[PDB]
Amino acid sequence: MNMLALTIILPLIGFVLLAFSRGRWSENVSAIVGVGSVGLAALVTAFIGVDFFANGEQTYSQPLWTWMSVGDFNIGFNLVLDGLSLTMLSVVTGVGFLIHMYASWYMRGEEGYSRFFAYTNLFIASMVVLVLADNLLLMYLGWEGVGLCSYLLIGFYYTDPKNGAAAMKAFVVTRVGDVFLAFALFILYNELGTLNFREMVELAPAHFADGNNMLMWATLMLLGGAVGKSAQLPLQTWLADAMAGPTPVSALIHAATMVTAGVYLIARTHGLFLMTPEVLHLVGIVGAVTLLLAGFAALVQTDIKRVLAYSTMSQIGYMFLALGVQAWDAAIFHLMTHAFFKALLFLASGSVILACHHEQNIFKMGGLRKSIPLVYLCFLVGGAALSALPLVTAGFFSKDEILAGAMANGHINLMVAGLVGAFMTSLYTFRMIFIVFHGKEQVTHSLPLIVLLILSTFVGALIVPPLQGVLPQTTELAHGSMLTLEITSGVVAVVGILLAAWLWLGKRTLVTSIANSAPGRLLGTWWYNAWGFDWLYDKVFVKPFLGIAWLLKRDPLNSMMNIPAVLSRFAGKGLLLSENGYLRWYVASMSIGAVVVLALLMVLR
Amino acid sequence: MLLPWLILIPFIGGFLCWQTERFGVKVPRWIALITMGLTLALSLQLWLQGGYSLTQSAGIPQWQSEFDMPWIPRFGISIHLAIDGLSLLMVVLTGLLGVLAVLCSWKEIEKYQGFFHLNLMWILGGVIGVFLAIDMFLFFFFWEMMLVPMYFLIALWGHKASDGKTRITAATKFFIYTQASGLVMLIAILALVFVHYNATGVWTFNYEELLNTPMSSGVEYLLMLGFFIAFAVKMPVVPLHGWLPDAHSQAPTAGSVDLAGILLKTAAYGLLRFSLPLFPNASAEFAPIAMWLGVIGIFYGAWMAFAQTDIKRLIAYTSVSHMGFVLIAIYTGSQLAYQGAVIQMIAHGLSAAGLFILCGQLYERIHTRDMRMMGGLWSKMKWLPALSLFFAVATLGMPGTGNFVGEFMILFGSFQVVPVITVISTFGLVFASVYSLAMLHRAYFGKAKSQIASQELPGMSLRELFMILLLVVLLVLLGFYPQPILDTSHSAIGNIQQWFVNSV
Numbered sequence A: 001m002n003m004l005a006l007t008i009i010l011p012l013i014g015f016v017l018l019a020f021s022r023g024r025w026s027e028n029v030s031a032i033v034g035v036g037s038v039g040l041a042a043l044v045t046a047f048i049g050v051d052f053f054a055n056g057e058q059t060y061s062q063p064l065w066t067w068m069s070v071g072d073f074n075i076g077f078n079l080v081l082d083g084l085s086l087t088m089l090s091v092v093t094g095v096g097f098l099i100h101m102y103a104s105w106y107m108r109g110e111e112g113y114s115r116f117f118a119y120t121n122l123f124i125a126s127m128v129v130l131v132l133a134d135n136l137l138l139m140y141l142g143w144e145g146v147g148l149c150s151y152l153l154i155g156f157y158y159t160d161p162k163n164g165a166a167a168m169k170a171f172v173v174t175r176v177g178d179v180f181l182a183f184a185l186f187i188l189y190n191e192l193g194t195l196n197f198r199e200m201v202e203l204a205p206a207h208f209a210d211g212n213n214m215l216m217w218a219t220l221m222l223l224g225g226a227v228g229k230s231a232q233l234p235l236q237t238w239l240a241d242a243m244a245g246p247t248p249v250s251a252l253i254h255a256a257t258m259v260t261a262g263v264y265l266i267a268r269t270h271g272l273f274l275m276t277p278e279v280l281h282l283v284g285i286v287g288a289v290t291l292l293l294a295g296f297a298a299l300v301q302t303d304i305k306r307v308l309a310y311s312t313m314s315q316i317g318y319m320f321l322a323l324g325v326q327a328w329d330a331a332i333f334h335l336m337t338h339a340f341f342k343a344l345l346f347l348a349s350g351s352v353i354l355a356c357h358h359e360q361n362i363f364k365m366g367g368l369r370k371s372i373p374l375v376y377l378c379f380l381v382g383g384a385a386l387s388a389l390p391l392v393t394a395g396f397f398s399k400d401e402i403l404a405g406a407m408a409n410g411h412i413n414l415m416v417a418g419l420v421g422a423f424m425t426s427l428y429t430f431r432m433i434f435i436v437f438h439g440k441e442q443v444t445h446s447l448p449l450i451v452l453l454i455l456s457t458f459v460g461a462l463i464v465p466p467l468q469g470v471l472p473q474t475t476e477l478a479h480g481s482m483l484t485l486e487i488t489s490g491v492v493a494v495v496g497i498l499l500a501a502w503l504w505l506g507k508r509t510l511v512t513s514i515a516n517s518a519p520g521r522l523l524g525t526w527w528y529n530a531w532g533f534d535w536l537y538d539k540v541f542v543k544p545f546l547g548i549a550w551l552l553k554r555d556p557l558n559s560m561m562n563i564p565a566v567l568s569r570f571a572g573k574g575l576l577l578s579e580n581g582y583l584r585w586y587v588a589s590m591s592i593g594a595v596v597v598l599a600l601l602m603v604l605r
Numbered sequence B: 001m002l003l004p005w006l007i008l009i010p011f012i013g014g015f016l017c018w019q020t021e022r023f024g025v026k027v028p029r030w031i032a033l034i035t036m037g038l039t040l041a042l043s044l045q046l047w048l049q050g051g052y053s054l055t056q057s058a059g060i061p062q063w064q065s066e067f068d069m070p071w072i073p074r075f076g077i078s079i080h081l082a083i084d085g086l087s088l089l090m091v092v093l094t095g096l097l098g099v100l101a102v103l104c105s106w107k108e109i110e111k112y113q114g115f116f117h118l119n120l121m122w123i124l125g126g127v128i129g130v131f132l133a134i135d136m137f138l139f140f141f142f143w144e145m146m147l148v149p150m151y152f153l154i155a156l157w158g159h160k161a162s163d164g165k166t167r168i169t170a171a172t173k174f175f176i177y178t179q180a181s182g183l184v185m186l187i188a189i190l191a192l193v194f195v196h197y198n199a200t201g202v203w204t205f206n207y208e209e210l211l212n213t214p215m216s217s218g219v220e221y222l223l224m225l226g227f228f229i230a231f232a233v234k235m236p237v238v239p240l241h242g243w244l245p246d247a248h249s250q251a252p253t254a255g256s257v258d259l260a261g262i263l264l265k266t267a268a269y270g271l272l273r274f275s276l277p278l279f280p281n282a283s284a285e286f287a288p289i290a291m292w293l294g295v296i297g298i299f300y301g302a303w304m305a306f307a308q309t310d311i312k313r314l315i316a317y318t319s320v321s322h323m324g325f326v327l328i329a330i331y332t333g334s335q336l337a338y339q340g341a342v343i344q345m346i347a348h349g350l351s352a353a354g355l356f357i358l359c360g361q362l363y364e365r366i367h368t369r370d371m372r373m374m375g376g377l378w379s380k381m382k383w384l385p386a387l388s389l390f391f392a393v394a395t396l397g398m399p400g401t402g403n404f405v406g407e408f409m410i411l412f413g414s415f416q417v418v419p420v421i422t423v424i425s426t427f428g429l430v431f432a433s434v435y436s437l438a439m440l441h442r443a444y445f446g447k448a449k450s451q452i453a454s455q456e457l458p459g460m461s462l463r464e465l466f467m468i469l470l471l472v473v474l475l476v477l478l479g480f481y482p483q484p485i486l487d488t489s490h491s492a493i494g495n496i497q498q499w500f501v502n503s504v
């Protein structure tokens, strides 16, 4: 278990080597370095899990050095490992290893190969730092590393200014959420005097026995940081534009690293959120609203990648609902299963966009099952797991546990919202699948596809998270009650896919009747632009920022301090009018001064 | 004992590099490099022999080294030098920045390089003397003496593409600002000395004797106002800030002048050393105005840096924002915020030094500085865009670099003191990320917007790459292991904080 720091050291070494290589190395050597770094991280993680289960699942701590030490401010470089940290360490390492294999096949002949692999290695290292951190400041270091690597990888094609604008907007939105996280850090250190999570859980109910407003503020700011990183309300707008990057970048962001950081922050500080029930209720409400809005947005999207983005938004909203109903185990189970099938869907979409020309609309594509059937069945199982198809997909069991935890704690409305979201999820997923793959035609990568094919089924559901002794157990349900909820969820999913097949498989006449209707056009244009959130954030934040910058670009304070210079020049030019060179005026001025001096002497005598 | 040599070795080296020009025109750069190496080695030996990690706070005065020699005994004026943790850290930073400034002017083989290097040596010696003098008249003397070579360097060796008259205007605005503010400082020094003389009856100009002075409220407020006006011009603090982009834009193209005396934060050292201990009640009353001026400086510098089409003016406004952060930290009264201010000072010096050297190299490569005439420089340059990305990431407060560490202890201490200033400054950090990304995407990303950026450019030499990688390594080490720097400056910061809070 002593090799816990190797999971950070090896991706850091790979990133440094591939950054200082500067593309001088061959493609095979760069691929070997990057994929081998992430694979050695995965192997060290596997050995760590073996040794973790061999010792009876005990929480381990590995300190390296003390980061900062000023008075009571003591922050250290201590890694921690419990069941949750091991769970998403395994998720991040394995999914990143598969994505790195797929990207090593995918980016052959691309400019920036070593730079891409260095950035992804730094992404992996930052997320391992995030999930292994014992305190909030080291987790903040991993948090900002995740944000910076996402910004660098989204705008990987730096020649296109749209990619750069998308990366800049994603970095700004994540940094606003990161500022909210720092607000939580400042409040927690000011109240408790420590930043270690276990020490907060120990010393919080004693300190907050009388007043709980500051703990409420800290948990609210933690929720703000979580919705900033996990793309929820009100900081969700960055993902659809962040889609503009490469495909394995999207797979790493939506499956392994970026969107799971908020869920990690909610689940790791579960004690502090348990001390603030209203904030946890707000987490559940935010998750429900985000999943509903994401489904309604993805129903009308005209691209595969945007549909997958809003599907990621909806499933992160599902996880936030699970956290809000105190179903933590269901949230982490859905975390790993959604990582598997969303990685599969994104890699399959990248294969599709490689096989079918350049980027195109979904209505351009049709009947693609015959030409590319392997990635068609990859899309089929990934959409079945996304839509929670019963008895064959791990997503069904994950959403089943989420909804069982939702209704087991009295959250009826959140369960209803989750069922409606599952219905809409099946609707948009099979709408995209039937539009793209049905109609009329117009070894490096096969192994990760095979692994994500297997893990998207119930084989992924066979993996039980080792979360006993870390997160509290969800309250159990009556067997008939969860049987009824299971059959209701299966009925909802099956009627969703049946409605999608009735609407989009054949000649879309009922679909084009709704779409070409004026209220249908209005609702489609509303949902297609992310419910006008980007428009509002441009008109409320971006536009006055640009206006203030344009107003201030002449430096008004510099002119306000240049006022006495122009006053001095004007006064000097005015005083130079007395020196006209006339002797009679000089004698007159001498007499004038004589009268002035004399009169001043007598009035002040 | 070593402190007089720490001051006059730059002066003697400047004299020798002026006088050695007849032996060859490539000689004075070697003399300047050797002299700055000796100064930095003396500072490092003082760091080793000081034992600063094991030094505890014992109260002002507490100097790990001292020196005294009478200079004008009529007024009780002596050349009085002293070193402790914070002063030695700033002297080491000055030596390192002077070494980088000498190495950054290696390729200038012009016919009057001896005067250039003598002026550089005199600037660095004046900065060291400012960091070392605990006699108020000597401190003011160094404070104004380090600016005449700056004026002559800007006005004569400045931006050769620009006309001379613009350089004259910029250098004259800089010198007028600094000298008028320092004249207000000298008036404050004289009035404090006369208050001491009326109270006790002995002529003195020593900071140790001027600490324990009996005085009323309102005169102390005016005296602190004079000191703060001088430091706020030098810091800079808005609206006394336009000399910084005016001097940076018309600086010599190597960027060594920015490293020599501009990027070394003598004003924050003066605020910590002289403004707070001599006038604690006035500083406590001025703390809301100081924090709000820092907030306005952060956001004004952010909005100016985003609006700038020029790289040097952009980095100048980044400096304005970061010293707004430091000014916020200085008046809180928290030891954590003070240590964060010291870390932010050192890390900002390193990061802005890297940014200025990279901008100078970029201007040497492309012969223009407007950002609308470049773009997509990642594909046309070998090392410069990657290091520029690292330094811009450093300036926005990214962990793994000391800027994040410094301003985060600043915000931690500030939130322990005042929450609203902290939250508004943290949105200022959002603005800082905004302007850093704006500079990166205007300069090195996108398509080429002119003809010079559409062709390949020559790469860096071993010297430039060595200096930039040294700055990168130092910034990464400061970001990940800042503990020796905190332990060096812990005693003096504790003395200043205890004096500030034990009298209010």
Ligand SMILES: CCCCCCCCCCCCCCCCCC(=O)OC[C@H](COP(=O)(O)OCCN)OC(=O)CCCCCCCCCCCCCCCCC
Pocket (backbone or CB within 6 Å): A164, A165, A166, A168, A169, A172, A173, A176, A234, A235, A537, A538, A541, A542, A545, A546, B427, B430, B434, B438, B441, B442
């Ligand atoms: C209910 C609300 C909940 C909170 C919501 C918070 C929303 C935060 C802001 C989200 C939107 C960020 C958009 C960033 C876009 C960046 C990309 C872009 O559009 O770049 C264009 C421009 C590029 O600059 P340049 O290269 O000079 O110009 C070339 C010509 N275009 O670059 C620009 O124009 C840069 C524009 C930057 C604007 C930054 C605005 C930050 C606002 C922070 C507000 C935080 C509020 C916190 C809550 C307060 C509650 C009281």
Ligand SMILES: CCCCCCCCCCCCCCCCCC(=O)OC[C@H](COP(=O)(O)OCCN)OC(=O)CCCCCCCCCCCCCCCCC
Pocket (backbone or CB within 6 Å): A561, A562, A564, A565, A566, A568, A569, B169, B172, B173, B176, B177, B178, B180, B181, B184, B229, B233, B240
């Ligand atoms: C915080 C406020 C309170 C404390 C203030 C402390 C004082 C120091 C800080 C403020 C300094 C302000 C200096 C403003 C002028 C800077 C110098 C300058 O701009 O010079 C260039 C200018 C000529 O430039 P140009 O536009 O080309 O003119 C064509 C000439 N043929 O040259 C000219 O136009 C002529 C310059 C004449 C000399 C400079 C002006 C001195 C005026 C007195 C300054 C003292 C403070 C006065 C009160 C300040 C506000 C309260």
Ligand SMILES: CCCCCCCCCCCCCCCCCC(=O)OC[C@H](COP(=O)(O)OCCN)OC(=O)CCCCCCCCCCCCCCCCC
Pocket (backbone or CB within 6 Å): A564, A567, A568, B216, B217, B218, B219, B221, B222, B225, B229, B232, B293
């Ligand atoms: C050519 C034309 C253009 C160029 C020239 C323009 C003008 C240049 C000169 C500008 C400055 C004018 C003089 C300013 C100082 C005034 C001093 C004063 O009025 O003092 C009165 C009083 C003295 O204190 P007293 O009450 O006697 O103390 C004993 C009680 N125990 O004091 C008190 O009771 C306390 C008073 C405190 C505040 C006095 C100073 C105000 C300064 C305002 C601007 C600065 C604001 C703060 C800093 C902002 C950032 C720089």
Ligand SMILES: CCCCCCCCCCCCCCCCCC(=O)OC[C@H](COP(=O)(O)OCCN)OC(=O)CCCCCCCCCCCCCCCCC
Pocket (backbone or CB within 6 Å): B184, B187, B188, B191, B195, B198, B214, B215, B216, B217, B219, B222, B223, B225, B226, B229
């Ligand atoms: C344009 C740039 C320059 C700025 C303008 C020029 C300077 C203006 C200074 C204004 C001073 C106003 C003083 C008003 C009260 C005078 C009478 C008085 O009450 O004196 C009190 C005291 C003498 O009586 P004593 O028995 O010594 O009592 C000890 C008191 N604790 O008196 C004393 O002990 C001495 C009082 C000294 C007061 C401070 C003087 C210098 C302050 C720094 C510079 C001015 C403020 C900063 C710049 C402002 C903006 C430019």
Ligand SMILES: CCCCCCCCCCCCCCCCCCCC
Pocket (backbone or CB within 6 Å): B089, B092, B093, B346, B474, B475, B477, B478, B481, B482, B483, B484, B485
């Ligand atoms: C004044 C300029 C400061 C620049 C930043 C310096 C930051 C401190 C770096 C110290 C070295 C860190 C790496 C080696 C640690 C060795 C520890 C040995 C004893 C355990």
